[PDB]
Symmetry: C2
Subunit: 808 residues, 2 copies
Amino acid sequence: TLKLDTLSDRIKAHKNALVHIVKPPVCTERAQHYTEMYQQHLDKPIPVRRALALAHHLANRTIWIKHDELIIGNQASEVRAAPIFPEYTVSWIEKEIDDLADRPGAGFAVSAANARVLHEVCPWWRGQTVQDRCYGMFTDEQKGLLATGIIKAEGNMTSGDAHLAVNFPLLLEKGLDGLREEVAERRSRINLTVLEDLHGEQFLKAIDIVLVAVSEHIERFAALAREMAATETRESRRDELLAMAENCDLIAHQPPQTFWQALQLCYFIQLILQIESNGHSVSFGRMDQYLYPYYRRDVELNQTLDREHAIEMLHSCWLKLLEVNKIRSGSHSKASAGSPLYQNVTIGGQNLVDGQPMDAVNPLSYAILESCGRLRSTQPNLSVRYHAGMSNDFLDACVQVIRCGFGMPAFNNDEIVIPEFIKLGIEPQDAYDYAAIGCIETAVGGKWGYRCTGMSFINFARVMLAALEGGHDATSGKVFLPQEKALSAGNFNNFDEVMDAWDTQIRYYTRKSIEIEYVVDTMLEENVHDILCSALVDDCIERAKSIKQGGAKYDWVSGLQVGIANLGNSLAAVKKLVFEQGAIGQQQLAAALADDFDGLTHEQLRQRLINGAPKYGNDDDTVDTLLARAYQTYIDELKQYHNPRYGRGPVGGNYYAGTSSISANVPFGAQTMATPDGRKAHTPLAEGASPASGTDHLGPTAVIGSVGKLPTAAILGGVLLNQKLNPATLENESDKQKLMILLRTFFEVHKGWHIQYNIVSRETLLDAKKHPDQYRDLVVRVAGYSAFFTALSPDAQDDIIARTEHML
Amino acid sequence: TLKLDTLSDRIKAHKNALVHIVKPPVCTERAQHYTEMYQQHLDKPIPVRRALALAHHLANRTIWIKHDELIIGNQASEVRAAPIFPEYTVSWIEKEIDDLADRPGAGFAVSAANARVLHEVCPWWRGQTVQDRCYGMFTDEQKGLLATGIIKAEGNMTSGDAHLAVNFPLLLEKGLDGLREEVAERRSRINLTVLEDLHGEQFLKAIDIVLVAVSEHIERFAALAREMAATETRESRRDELLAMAENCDLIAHQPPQTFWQALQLCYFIQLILQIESNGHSVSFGRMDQYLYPYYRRDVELNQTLDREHAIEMLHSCWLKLLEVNKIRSGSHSKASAGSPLYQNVTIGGQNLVDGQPMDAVNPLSYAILESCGRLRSTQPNLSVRYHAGMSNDFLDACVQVIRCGFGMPAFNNDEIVIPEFIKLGIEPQDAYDYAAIGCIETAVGGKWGYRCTGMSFINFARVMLAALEGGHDATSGKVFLPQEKALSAGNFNNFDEVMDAWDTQIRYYTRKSIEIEYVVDTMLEENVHDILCSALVDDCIERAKSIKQGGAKYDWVSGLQVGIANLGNSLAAVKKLVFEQGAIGQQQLAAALADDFDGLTHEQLRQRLINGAPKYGNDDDTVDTLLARAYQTYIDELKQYHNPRYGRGPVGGNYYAGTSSISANVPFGAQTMATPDGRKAHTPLAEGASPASGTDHLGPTAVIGSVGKLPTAAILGGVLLNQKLNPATLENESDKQKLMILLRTFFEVHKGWHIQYNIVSRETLLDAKKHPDQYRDLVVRVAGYSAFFTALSPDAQDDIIARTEHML
C-alpha cells in the first residue's frame, strides 16, 4: 500500500517552478568555452583538446543552487536552459537562430545577447562539425538518399551518441580518486616507443584532465553551498547547505559513505555526462541495486535517515533530471515530441548470484517506484524489469503507480532479454544485470557501447511504396533502385513477385543505411570523443581508447524501422484485394495511390482497403505473419554486416532490429504518400510496433497476440507496444487482477518485449488542448516515454488523441 | 675515353643563368593555394583535402618555359624560387620573415608583395602545423631535450619526409592512365560497410584526384609549348616546342615511347613530388637501368636520336634539378650548407637475372656519367654502385669524371649493401636493385618507405661529455640522466666505469630519441599525407594507405649520430692519459674542460690530449676499436625498438645506424663545449665518419683501415668517408691506377660503405673566398653531396679548407 498523493512543499514548489517554464532559454556558455579552448588548443590531440574544453567550461561556467534543492548541480546558466553543442553541427542553428521561439512544441527563448554570441561562435565551426565532415565523406548516392528522408541519421549527425548507462557501481566503489589511481596505474604501463601506447597515452591523459576537473567542480559547488549558507537566514536550510558542502567535499574524492552522498555523486556524473555531450537517453541503470547498500544502512539498519526523507532526496534528483534540457532542429524536434531526454531508471529484475537467479526487488525498488508515483514527473523514465518470480505485492505496487496517470512504470521482460542476451554471447551474470536504456531498448549498463538503439531510421512504408512501383519514391520522385515491376504497369504476375520486390528494395536500403552509419559513426569517432563517459565504461581505461573506438566490453547497436503496421497492413491488402481476389486492379490501385484517393470513387476503393482486408493487431495470422515475413528480410540482411567497432575490442560488434522510433511516425508520415492500407498521403504512420490507430477492433488480448508474432528475439532494440485505457477501466480490484494476468501472460507466454499503459480520458486531452495553463502538470505517454501534454505540438497531441481506447 | 669539356650554347647559357642567381626569390603561390583549399575543404578527409590542394595549385600556379630548355616544368613562379610549405611549420617563417636576405649561406629575396602574402597566410596555420602538433604532444622531458639540441629532429618537424626514390619503372610501364586503371580496379574492391575500406576509399579517391591533376598539368604545359611556338621566330626552337607539346600530350596519359618522352615524364614526377612536398633527397634511382630500353632503341638500335642530343636532353634535366630550391630556418640551414636538394642518380651496379648476378653497366650508364662530367653541376648527385665485376673501362671513366673537380661520382658498394640487405629479409632480386638515396644512404627504389636515413640527430660528443661529468650537459646546464661519477669529483675508479657511464647515458638518449621520432612520425602520418609519392611506391595503392601509414613494401629508417671521431678520440685520450698512465688527473681534465683549455697551462694539457694519444684515422686499433665499441652500444640499443610502421604492412619496420649528418658537425660543434680529444669549445665536430681534420697523419690507406673497423653492416644509413686530394696527385696514369686499386681494396677487402673524392687546391678555395664573382661555377664536395663554393657561408667554407690534404 503506497502513499502516492503526498509531496513536500519543497518538492511542490520546485516541481511547479519547472512545469511553468514553457519557453525555456538557450545558454551559450558551453558553446563559448568549447570554441575558446578548441582555438587555443588546436595543437593538442582531439581527446586532449576536448578534455581541456570540458575543464575550462566547468571551471568558468555559471553554477548555482536553487529551489532549496537537496541534490545540486545545474546544467546551464539558467533554469532548464539548453546548452549549445557546436562540435556536432551548427547547420540548423544558423538557419533557425531567428525563428526558435515559435516552433510548435520546440520553442526556445534566445536572448539578444545569446543571439550575438552564437553569431560569432557558429561560423568558426563551419567545415569542422561532425555533420559537415559527414557530408565531406558521403558518396553522392548516400547524399541523395538522406535528402529524400527514406533513410535518416539526423540524430547521429547532430548530437553526441549517449544511449547508455555508465558504470555507477565502479564510480561508487572507487570514488574519483580511485579512478585517478586506476588511470595512473594504466599510464605506468605506457611505452612511448609503441605506437598504440603513444595514442593510448593521449587518451589516458585526457581522462585524467577530466577526472581532475570533475573533482574540482564538485569542490566548486561545496564552496558555493558554504557561501550561500553564510547568508541563509532560515536555520534549517542553512544546516542543509552545510551538510551538502560537507558531502560534496567527500564525494569530490572518496567513495561516498551515505545514501545522500551516493545519490549526489551519481547525479553529478549523470549531469556532467550531459554537459560534455548532448546525447540523450543517458540512463541511470539499476539504481535500486547499486544504491541499495547505502539505503539499507541509512534507512533500515542504522535508521539514521528517515525513509520519507530518502524519498525526498530521490524527488530532488528527479526534478534535477527534468531540468536537463536539449534543443533540436525544427525537423528532428518533430520526431521527438515533448523535448524528451529519456533519462531511464531501471528497477526490479533479478540477479545471478553464484549461478542461481534471484529476485532483485528490494525496499529501494519500492521506495523508487513510490517516489515516482508521488511526483508524477516525466523524468526519470521509470522501467520495471518483469520476471516470472516477481511478486504480486510488487506487481500490485507497479499497477498502483500505473493508476496515477503519468504513464509509468513501463515494463521490460527478463523472460526474453536474458535468454537472448546470453545467446548473443553476453556473460550470464552480465545478461542478468541488464538495464533499460532511454525508452525500451536494453543493454548491460556500464559495459556496453553507445546506441543499443538509435542508429539510422528507415521508412519501411516508403520502401514498400517503391517496391510496388518500379523503385519510384513518390515523395521525392527518385528511383534509387530501378525495377521493372510496377502497379501502374500492371506487370506483376502474382503476389510472390511483390514480395520479391519488397525483399530486393529493402536489401538495397539496408546496405545504404549501414554505409551511411559507417560514415557517421566514423566522423563521431574521430571528432567528438566522450572523455568522462568513456572513462566510466568497461573497459575503456584499460584499452586506453574511447567507446567509439572499441573501448566497451560489449557493442551491439540497432537502427529504427518505421511504419511497421503500415507495411503489414499494406501488403495484406494488396495480396487479398488485388491478387487473391482480383477485386481491385493493379493500375487501378496505382492510380488511387498517385491521386491520394481523391474523388468519391477512389474514396470507396480506399474504404475497401481499410476494412475489407485484415489489419495487424486483430490476432489475424494472415496479416500478422505476413508482416513478420516482410520484416524478416531486413533482419536477415543485418546478419551480413558488422558494426564499426567489430574486431576492435568489444564482444559482438553486430546489429539487430529496433522499433523505438519515438514520434517519427508523424513526420515520416508527412513525407509518405498514400499507402495501400488506405492511409491518406501525409498522415502519420503507425508508431513503434503498435497497430495503426483505430484498426484494432478485437480488444487488447488480440493486440498482444499480433505483437507476439513478430520476431521479438531478433528485435533487441525493442518492440514498442503502446496501449490506452480510460481511467474507469482500472478502477476496481478485479480490473487490477485483469491487467496483472494480462501482463504475466504477455511476458511469460508471448515472450513480449515491453508494455506501457496510458490511463487518460478523451475529455481530459480535449480540455487541455483548449486550456493549457490548467494542465501544465498533465503527463501523457507518447512512444516509450512520458511528456507534458501542454508542451506538445497540436500534431503530436492529436496523434495521441487518435489512438485506440481499449477495454479490459 | 670521354669528351668532358664540351657543352652546347643552349646548356651553357642555361647553366650560367642559374649559377648567377645568388639571392634566389621566395614564391608564395603554393602557400596561398594550400591555404585556400584547406579553408574551403575543412570538411574533407585530410588526404582528400591535400589532394584538392595540389590539384588547385597545379591548375592555377604560374607555369613557364625558359632558357630554350628541352625538359620543361618549373617548381615555382620565378627561376630557382623556393616555394613555401606552411603545413609543416610557420614558426621559423614568422620569426625570420624580415631577415632572410642576409643569413650567411642561406639568403633569399622576399619581395614586399610576397612578404604581405606570408603575413596573411601564416597566422592561419598556427596550431595546425606538423611542428605545432608535435609540441602539443611531446612530454616536458622530450621538450627539454629538444631545447638543448643534444637530440634534434628539426628536419622532420619542419619538412616533408621524402628521402626515397619512387617507382619510375611502374610509371613508365603503365603511364598515368594505367595508374588510374589500377586505382579504379582497387576501388572496385572497396566495401563501404568495412571500416578499413571506408578509410582506404578516402585515400584511393585522393590518389585519383591527384593523378587526374598530373595528367591535366602535363596537358597545361603542352598548351604552353604551343602558344609559345606560335610566337617563336627562330624555326629550330619552334620545332622543339612543337615536338615537346606533342610529347607532353602523349605522356599526359600513355606509356612514353621515346627516350625524350620517358625522361620528361620522369622529370615531371620528380618535379611534382617536390611541389606537393618540400622533403629533400627525392632521388631518381637507377635511371641508367629503367631508361636504358628507350636509349637502346632511340640511340643504338634505330639511331633516330643522336647520342650527343641524348646527352643534351640529360643536361636539360640536370639543370631543371638545379632549379629545384628549398628554404630552411636559420638553424637548420647551418646543418645543410649550400642549399642542397640531394637529388640522387644511381648508375652501375648489378642485376639479379634468373638468380644469377650480372653487371648492370650499359651505354646509358656511360652517357649519364659523361653528361655529368661535361656539366659539372651540383645536381644530380651522381652515385656509382661499385661491384667486384665492374670493369676497369667503366671504373676508368668514373675516375676521368672524378678528375673534373666537382666531387662526382661518389661510390656505394654492392659488396656490403646486397649481402646485408638480404640478411635483413629483402628479397634478393630487390636487394640487387638498390639505389643510392640523397647522399650515401641506400634503399630499394620504388618499394621503400621514407627516410632510409634522416631521422633524429644525436650529438654523441655532448652525450660523452655528460657521461664524463655526472650527466651534466655543459652547454645547457641540464642533467637529464643524473649519475654519481664525474671527472670533477675524481670518483671514477677506472676506465671501465667511464665506458659504463657512456653506455648508460647513450641508452637513455637513444630511447628518448625514439620517443621523439614516434611523436614526429605520427604527426606527419596524420597531417601531411603525400598523395602522389604514395601512389608511386609499392604497395600503397593495393594497401589503400600512405607510405607513412605502412604502405611501403619495405620500411627501415636511420637517424644520424654526430661526432664520431670526437667520441673515439676523446675516450682514447682519457683512457690513456688519465687512467692507463695517471699522466693527467680527473679533476684536472674536468677543470680544463670547464675552462675551454684557457691559459698557457691548460693549453699545454690540451696539446698533450691532441698529440699524446692516438686518433681515429691512423689505423691504430687501440682507438679505432674503442670507437667501434662505443658506437656498438647505440647500435645494440636500436635492436630493442621498432619503427612506427612495424606490423602495419611493411617488411622490417626497424632501425639501423647512420652517419650522413651533412654539415651538422659545424652547428653541433657550436653547441658542444671543450672535449678531451683537445677540441676547443664551439669549434666544429668531425663530419660524417671522417677523421677529425688534421689528425690523420699516416695517409689515405691508414684512413680506410680505421674506417673499415667500424661496424659497417650495422650502419646501413651509411658510413660517410670524405677525402681531399690536390689535383696534381691525380694527374698521371699511375696516379690513376693507384686510386683505382685503393677503391677496389676498400670495397672488396675492407667492405667499405662509400668514398667520395675532393680534387681541389688550397689556393683555389682561398682565392674564391676573396673573389666569389669569379668562381660562381666552382663546385666543392661537402659531406655526401657537392655544392657551389661561392654559395657557402664562411664557416662552412673554412671547414672544407681545414680538411686534411692527402697524398696517393
